[PDB]
Amino acid sequence: IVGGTASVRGEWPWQVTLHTTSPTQRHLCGGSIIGNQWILTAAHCFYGVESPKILRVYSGILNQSEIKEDTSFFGVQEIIIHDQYKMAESGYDIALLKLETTVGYGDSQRPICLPSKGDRNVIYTDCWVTGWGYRKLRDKIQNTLQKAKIPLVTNEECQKRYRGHKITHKMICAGYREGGKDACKGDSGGPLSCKHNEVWHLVGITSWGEGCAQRERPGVYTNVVEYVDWILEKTQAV
């Protein structure tokens, strides 16, 4: 996160840190708890991940230093990547992790609501991007979970900013015209959380951008409202 501040413990209880153990253990991506065995994250996070056996999901984490060999985590039973996904820049950058065990909800770990079908017309004015990502293009994973408040940008304005790309309505953009605050490396897969009627909604999944927090380069996010039926197809399968 560029231009952000330290989060307070319990502030983003749906935020997870997804770690890989191959070749060595390190943070790989962010993610969001959406159900008691479900993490919603970005499909591009699994490039070269050949098995869910190398993955560890840690919930209830503020500081990466809380993670040691004796720290509990959730194993991943299954990685479900949208079958139309090719790359982050072409969209469908969404994936589900089915956990080996059930998340017990509490003040440190709980789900974020998915957006409503009727809420595709609501104007979100209170949106925040969170993660342990870089504070600049050449940096390192941060110890403390960071947060930054970012305004949503119309699809038309986002398309003007990304000449040569196709910004679809399955994407949603966020950023200040003068830059300064944005997601960066290590934040991808994490949430873009917006508060409406005193309820937080998972509006976006951190996906891609040209550089980090550059002037007139908003962050591009998976527009979660456009994937609610796909999420329900996968999580509510009979």
Partner: peptide, 7 residues
């Protein structure tokens, strides 16, 4: 939430 994910 209005959208529900089954436990």
């Amino acid at each position: 939430c209005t959208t529900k994910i089954k436990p």
